[PDB]
Amino acid sequence: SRRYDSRTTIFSPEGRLYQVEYALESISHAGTAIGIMASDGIVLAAERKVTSTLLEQDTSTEKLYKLNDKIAVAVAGLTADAEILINTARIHAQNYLKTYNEDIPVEILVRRLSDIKQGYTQHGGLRPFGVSFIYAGYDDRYGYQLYTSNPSGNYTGWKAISVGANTSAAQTLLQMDYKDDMKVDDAIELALKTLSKTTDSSALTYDRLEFATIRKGANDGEVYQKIFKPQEIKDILVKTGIT
Amino acid sequence: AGYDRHITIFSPEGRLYQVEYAFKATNQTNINSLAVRGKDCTVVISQKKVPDKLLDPTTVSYIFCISRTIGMVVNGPIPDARNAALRAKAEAAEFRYKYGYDMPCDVLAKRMANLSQIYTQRAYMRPLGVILTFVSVDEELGPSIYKTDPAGYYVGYKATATGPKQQEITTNLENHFKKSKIDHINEESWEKVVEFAITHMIDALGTEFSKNDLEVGVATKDKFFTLSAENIEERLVAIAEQD
Amino acid sequence: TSIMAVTFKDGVILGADSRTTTGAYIANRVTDKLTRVHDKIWCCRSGSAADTQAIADIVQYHLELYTSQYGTPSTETAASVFKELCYENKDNLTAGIIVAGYDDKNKGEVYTIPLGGSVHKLPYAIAGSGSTFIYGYCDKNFRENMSKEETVDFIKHSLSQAIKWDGSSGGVIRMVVLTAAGVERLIFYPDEYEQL
Amino acid sequence: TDRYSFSLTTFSPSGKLGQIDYALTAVKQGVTSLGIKATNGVVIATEKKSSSPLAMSETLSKVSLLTPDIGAVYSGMGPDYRVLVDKSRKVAHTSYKRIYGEYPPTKLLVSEVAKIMQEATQSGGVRPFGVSLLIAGHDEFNGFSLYQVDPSGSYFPWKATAIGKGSVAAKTFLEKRWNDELELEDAIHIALLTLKESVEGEFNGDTIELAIIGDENPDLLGYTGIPTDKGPRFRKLTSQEINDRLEAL
Amino acid sequence: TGYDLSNSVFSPDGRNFQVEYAVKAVENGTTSIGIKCNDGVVFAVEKLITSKLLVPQKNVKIQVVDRHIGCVYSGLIPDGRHLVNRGREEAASFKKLYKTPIPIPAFADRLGQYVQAHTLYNSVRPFGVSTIFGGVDKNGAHLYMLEPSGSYWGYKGAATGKGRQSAKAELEKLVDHHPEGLSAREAVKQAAKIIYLAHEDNKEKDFELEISWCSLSETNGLHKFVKGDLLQEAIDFAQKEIN
Amino acid sequence: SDPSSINGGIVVAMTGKDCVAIACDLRLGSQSLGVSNKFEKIFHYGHVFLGITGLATDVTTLNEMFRYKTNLYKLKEERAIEPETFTQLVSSSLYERRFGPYFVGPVVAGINSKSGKPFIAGFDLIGCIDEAKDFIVSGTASDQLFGMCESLYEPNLEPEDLFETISQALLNAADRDALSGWGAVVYIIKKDEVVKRYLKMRQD
Amino acid sequence: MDIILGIRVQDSVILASSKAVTRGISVLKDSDDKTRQLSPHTLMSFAGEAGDTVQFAEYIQANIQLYSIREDYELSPQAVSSFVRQELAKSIRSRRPYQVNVLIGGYDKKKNKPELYQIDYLGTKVELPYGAHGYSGFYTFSLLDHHYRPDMTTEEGLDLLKLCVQELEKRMPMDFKGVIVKIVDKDGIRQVDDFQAQ
Amino acid sequence: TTIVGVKFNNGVVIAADTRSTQGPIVADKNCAKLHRISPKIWCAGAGTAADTEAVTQLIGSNIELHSLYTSREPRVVSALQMLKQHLFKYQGHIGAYLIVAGVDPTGSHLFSIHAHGSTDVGYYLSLGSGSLAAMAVLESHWKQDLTKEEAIKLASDAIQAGIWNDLGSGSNVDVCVMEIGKDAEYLRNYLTPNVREEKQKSYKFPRGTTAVLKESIVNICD
């Protein structure tokens, strides 16, 4: 019997931190969310998990959030743990803007957050964040960027990533069709062309989605950030492969 | 394997037994108490058992005077009740000071049912094993009676009972109130009401009382008083014939 | 202004004008400078306004919390809770305060807490800007233990001159008699004390 | 039993905090309560159970006013709700009204409350609240609203729903007779016929506590002279208003 | 049982065993008695001479509080002194505030409230002593006896310690054949008597008697130590009756 | 030396038929020395405008304090703050610092996207609020403005006439104020479309 | 006070800063460098109160450098001056404020434009084509109002700046012991040790 | 600043002009010294502007929190105990003198708190720049028991004596009447004795008078 998984403050004889690993395990219980890089934009796609006939969902949101006017994130994992972060993630973002009078660079914001998640892993009386994040944004340093972070506090930059349920599947399909230059309207395509394949429901219904993207060009010498409405979805959804 | 040791752990069925056990201790008192309200008075009854030829009874009560209008009776250990009696006895003083007017029965009971809740959720101490019964003549409700318990509960009573004999003293009243079809005792003066309780209690216990087996207090138009030693013998006499 | 409390046969009587000036303007001309901190314990405020007012407020508070657990408090007690506050804070307080109370046993006594929290128990005391004039009378016309009336016509003649020469003090007289009987309120209008 | 369900700080091998679910059990036990969103109003109701008729139930509310545009109800541990309430009515001033000169929108109060609900969790040494509330109100820019708040700190918005012992089915009943149109009087109806099956006691005017959010009451202010200050939308029906709507089924 | 380990914990029947065990340690210490004569009281404790190397007249077990309160206890001696120093501050600050030396009844709560407290938190050990004390105030003399749970009352005279029953039956008696206040002087005398009679449980261990008293007529309101001549008399006036 | 007159400057707002106008000079100087003529006192958060006068270092800080604050608002309520909801803010804000105030004289002015009604408001350093249906002035040439506004103002001007009236008030007070000038800028705010203009004035 | 001049030209910023240091009656030094490089393309001159002056300068320098290795990216003139104004801004309302005035002139390799920010101890910041702190302005500002043009060469600016100094010498009561000049541009910072070696 | 208050049979009434100063220059030509602490509890604030409007604000909010919790209508002495307890804590560095008035389920009340925390009571009170003006119009025309209309007529005829004879007060009169068993009535401008006469010339300029240097259309959203 006797196991080394009773807390975060304890290394197993092999230097494992189980409590942290179990949190990393809480993610595979969340609705699938995707992020795909593009030569001109970034796409965020998620699949509402929770469901019931009488559940308001046309107004409020649950997986996609604006942190900065140039940065967005996909959530996956403990609902409450997600807001606690998202908020501080927003405050930090504004202090940078208030100090340097410039907007905060993506990696810096992702790193600051991963650094808090790191901390709840090393001090007693604390429980790590049961959250995962897909950061999609743009700064003048490195153009468009796609980042990911887990409960262990590590982060990384993908060209196309998925987190949540059936990550194996979703991850696999992408690894296959992703064309390294792929335009935006092809990523939004590939978004569903993956989410579809890895669902359960008899059919993939619009009211069960969340899309958002980041585009920019010569036109608006800056970035336009859009969070699709139930409408646009039910529509672009038909334009593809749904009656 | 110790749910019931910690005041903070929920059993698989959200129980918190430590709070539950708290109660049985409110019984090892072995004293019964019922309180009934007149039309401009309120009276509480309680037995005064003194099992020792050495204890001088003057210092043997379970009813104290919180403020010059509110009185209280407790169904528990003299140590714990003496505590509560003090806190509340002070909430009174401070309330007046901070608001310009004398604190109502109904309120004081909520400060306590609240106090013994925070007392119990933050786990800064063990819950007191007593039941508190607050009586007085409010200037916005006159005959008022509220009773709090260890679990941080309270409510209004048209006249209630407490002790190792809940139901008896209780049902006996439910049939007397089931008739008068009203929610209070009718009578112009306290004297007569008092007589009503003793009267309507011996009935449920099945025993005679003298000027030392009982103990009573009453509330008038703003002037709470404890019934004298010898004086309690009085109404005991008057109602020993009008049977 | 003009305040005082006198001990006699039954117990004690404390009285004082109604005038409260702010410069040469009269902010209120009918003030109740006789605060009650308890049934048989009263006091007459002097000095600053806002300060004295709040002290009482507190002193009351304590006593009300005292009886509530240590039974009804003496009079010597009250005058203690009073100085405690007037001493520790002699730096940001301007209080004249005279304390008086009737205790069943000790009859009725009088203590005067002046600037500094220096406490004193005397037959009777007189404080207020106007007391400076009735040091002649007050002393030369004082017999130990008077009657309920034999004295009320003392407070009346003291408070008479006080008003007569001290602008900062006037209005209507106000007495409160603390006795075995209880609390009694008196009020003797202008056309009267001037008459004398 | 696990060895992981006795610590707020502990993750089970799968990833489920424990103490939370048992807390959430005390709720799935409490007395049945529901809430229905109309098009021109919202209704929140919950039943009453008497320890004995010797007790005055008309001195212990169950449907509470947080702001004159928001009310809320519950199912689970009585006592928690009583103070969770007063802490909510404050975090409503100190955190909004005192900074913006006005009362808060539905959405943000529910989140300011889940914020206090959150604390109970993240931290050993305390237990979460054994209550789950349905908060209903309305603010200019958002129309009417319906929200649920659990010990877990999370919170969601419904059109209609129920929590408590008799919820599995009550939540089934509603599902059937709900559509975007029901006027408030309809909701008030549909509610009673659902607060119906969910009882073993009786159906008088006392054992039923229901209130609703609707139109402004230019009477319930206490003053008149200021144009914009028009009135409170929250109305807790009285014992009478009730049983009358009970006769007409 | 797992309910006798922690100090805060309630047993299923609302029983706090740790406090109970506390009492077991009290009824094993030496014997302490308390007599309440007409105006004032009398105290006496049993000191046990273990060896001949024990300077006599030294190592006093009775402590005065302020200058009008007697005070004696039995059980854990260090816990003793402790509970009293607190009483000594509690006293002092009270006189410094109100001028008038502290009311014997008031004093008791202060101590109870304190002992009270050591039954609330599991990080501390309940007081291991029963205390007897009293003095003469404005309402004459009073005599209380506080115990390990913080419970306490007023007595006509009482005592705790290994041999207390004999002290009690030979105590109730004095009450019956004197129903009307004992005697200043006489109390002392009969005091030294009540100890011997009770020492028959330490028989083989020669002892030393210590008496103090407080009386409005012999002490003059102040609490004093019974040394000198009256100290001898009282002994013999007891050594004679011992035959 | 009065902290609120080292740097100098002025701001004025007016209301018209379905519109508002907010204008200010451009100078920032230390005492007599003129330092800049490109120092603007009018900022905006969404469709809400705020002009600020007084101690320059505080003017700047406040803008940053409000930008910061409004961005957090929008994000949380999923909508931009309104003119009134904003006034209440900058008032409390100014007050939380009642015993070490920022040395300014703000002036809010915008149109309510729901009602559609014009709004203008003023405050003093500790935050006392002040609505008015006609005009707000603040600054060193504060009096010169009250004199101009209490003459040239006219209820319900058309945006094209408002521009002329407001400009003239600003223009002329700045000429009788020794610490205000070096250029100006005026805004004409409608439900939609916002036109900004710089004016030509004496450079002394 | 000390002398602090600065002027932005076609593609670079120039900073002038008197060399003397005086303690009461004497002059303890006539070769002091009031400059302090924050990063490869940002330079900052200062002048103010005796102790406050360089304690602050170094502090700022330390923060920027820290940020730069951490991010491995170089903070921009605009953002650098913003940070400074923040600190000084907090400073003015603290137990004891730094009494330091400054000039920051860097090269924005991102826009390929030189920028010069002038900030005073109160937290008052402004972007200018040329600036000066203290009394230094009254003797120069008119000459620069007259000849300055944004198209000017680095070579032309110096010639201009020379005139301003010559004027400072002719009418200023204090003998500032000359100035030290420095240039910031696409290639970094260098010192015109030939305005001194002249 | 010129406020008064007077109680009658079934309630009390307070009035205040509407003119904020700031040196000799006028700031607000139509201010509002009358604030609401709670439905039937109102204040009149003289002295330092921001302070009074911010303090009533506070106390109000807290009392709202109080009644709710205690389930009873707000007493008036509470609002008083609160204010003067707070005012005092700050040894007068929060210059707000005022007249608190209202009605609770125990009668009608009227008080006057000064800056330092001192409070007094009477049947009629005056606080402000013209307190001596409107206090000659009260020590003359006052009698015990006054009709509602009389009380209203007196209070508003006191304020008026302030408007005209004092420079630190003018423009219109504002009134609030609190009556027992009845709601409260807020009368923003029960009078308007001052109304600038019409000008002598129209001062509108012909379009194009002002000289512009640049123009453009700025953006807002994203």
From Swiss-Prot, chain B:
Modification type Phosphoserine: residues: 228
Compartments, record wording: Cytoplasm; Nucleus
Chief location category: cytoplasm
SUPFAM superfamilies recorded: N-terminal nucleophile aminohydrolases (Ntn hydrolases) (SSF56235)
Covalent cross-link (Glycyl lysine isopeptide (Lys-Gly) (interchain with G-Cter in ubiquitin)), residues: 223
Classification via InterPro entries: Ntn_hydrolases_N, Proteasome_alpha, Proteasome_alpha-type, Proteasome_asu_N, Proteasome_sua/b, Proteasome_subunit_alpha6
UniProt keyword Membrane present: no
One Pfam family it belongs to: Proteasome
SMART domains in the record: Proteasome_A_N
UniProt protein name: Proteasome subunit alpha type-1
Organism: Saccharomyces cerevisiae (strain ATCC 204508 / S288c)
Gene: SCL1
UniProtKB/Swiss-Prot annotation, chain D:
Other facts noted in the record for this chain: Present with 7060 molecules/cell in log phase SD medium.
Protein name: Proteasome subunit alpha type-2
Main location: cytoplasm
Localisation: Cytoplasm; Nucleus
Gene that encodes the chain: PRE8
GO cellular component: nucleus; proteasome complex; proteasome core complex, alpha-subunit complex; proteasome storage granule
Keywords of the record: Cytoplasm, Isopeptide bond, Nucleus, Proteasome, Ubl conjugation
Biological source species: Saccharomyces cerevisiae (strain ATCC 204508 / S288c)
UniProt cross-references to InterPro entries, sorted A to Z: Ntn_hydrolases_N, Proteasome_alpha, Proteasome_alpha-type, Proteasome_asu_N, Proteasome_sua/b
Assembly and interaction partners: The 26S proteasome consists of a 20S proteasome core and two 19S regulatory subunits. The 20S proteasome core is composed of 28 subunits that are arranged in four stacked rings, resulting in a barrel-shaped structure. The two end rings are each formed by seven alpha subunits, and the two central rings are each formed by seven beta subunits. The catalytic chamber with the active sites is on the inside of the barrel.
One Pfam family this sequence matches: Proteasome
Gene Ontology terms: biological process: proteasomal ubiquitin-independent protein catabolic process; proteasome-mediated ubiquitin-dependent protein catabolic process
Family statement: Belongs to the peptidase T1A family.
Cross-link Glycyl lysine isopeptide (Lys-Gly) (interchain with G-Cter in ubiquitin) mapped to chain: 107
UniProtKB/Swiss-Prot annotation, chain F:
Single GO molecular function: endopeptidase activator activity
Superkingdom per UniProt: Eukaryota
Phosphoserine modifications at: 30
Keyword list, A-Z: Cytoplasm, Isopeptide bond, Nucleus, Phosphoprotein, Proteasome, Ubl conjugation
UniProt record, GO biological process: proteasomal ubiquitin-independent protein catabolic process; proteasome-mediated ubiquitin-dependent protein catabolic process
Localization per record: Cytoplasm; Nucleus
Xref: Pfam families: Proteasome
Keyword Repeat: no
Covalent cross-link site, Glycyl lysine isopeptide (Lys-Gly) (interchain with G-Cter in ubiquitin): 69
Entry GO terms, CC: cytosol; nucleus; proteasome complex; proteasome core complex, beta-subunit complex
Xref: InterPro entries: Ntn_hydrolases_N, Proteasome_beta_3, Proteasome_bsu_CS, Proteasome_sua/b, Proteasome_suB-type
Subunit composition and interactions: The 26S proteasome consists of a 20S proteasome core and two 19S regulatory subunits. The 20S proteasome core is composed of 28 subunits that are arranged in four stacked rings, resulting in a barrel-shaped structure. The two end rings are each formed by seven alpha subunits, and the two central rings are each formed by seven beta subunits. The catalytic chamber with the active sites is on the inside of the barrel.
Family label: Belongs to the peptidase T1B family.
Protein known as: Proteasome subunit beta type-3
Organism placement in taxonomy: Eukaryota, Fungi, Dikarya, Ascomycota, Saccharomycotina
Curated annotation (Swiss-Prot), chain H:
GO biological process, one term: proteasomal ubiquitin-independent protein catabolic process
Pfam families, per database record: Pr_beta_C, Proteasome
One GO term describing the cellular component: proteasome complex
One MF annotation (Gene Ontology) recorded for this entry: threonine-type endopeptidase activity
InterPro entries per the UniProt record, alphabetical: Ntn_hydrolases_N (IPR029055), Pept_T1A_subB (IPR000243), Proteasome_bsu_C (IPR024689), Proteasome_bsu_CS (IPR016050), Proteasome_sua/b (IPR001353), Proteasome_suB-type (IPR023333)
Catalysis performed (reactions): Cleavage of peptide bonds with very broad specificity
Main localization category: cytoplasm
Cell compartments where the protein resides: Cytoplasm; Nucleus
Subunit structure: The 26S proteasome consists of a 20S proteasome core and two 19S regulatory subunits. The 20S proteasome core is composed of 28 subunits that are arranged in four stacked rings, resulting in a barrel-shaped structure. The two end rings are each formed by seven alpha subunits, and the two central rings are each formed by seven beta subunits. The catalytic chamber with the active sites is on the inside of the barrel.
Domain of life: Eukaryota
Protein name: Proteasome subunit beta type-2
Broad enzyme group: hydrolase
Gene: PUP1
Note: The side chain of Thr-1 acts as a nucleophile, and the N-terminal amino group acts as a proton acceptor.
Catalytic residue positions: 1
EC number: 3.4.25.1
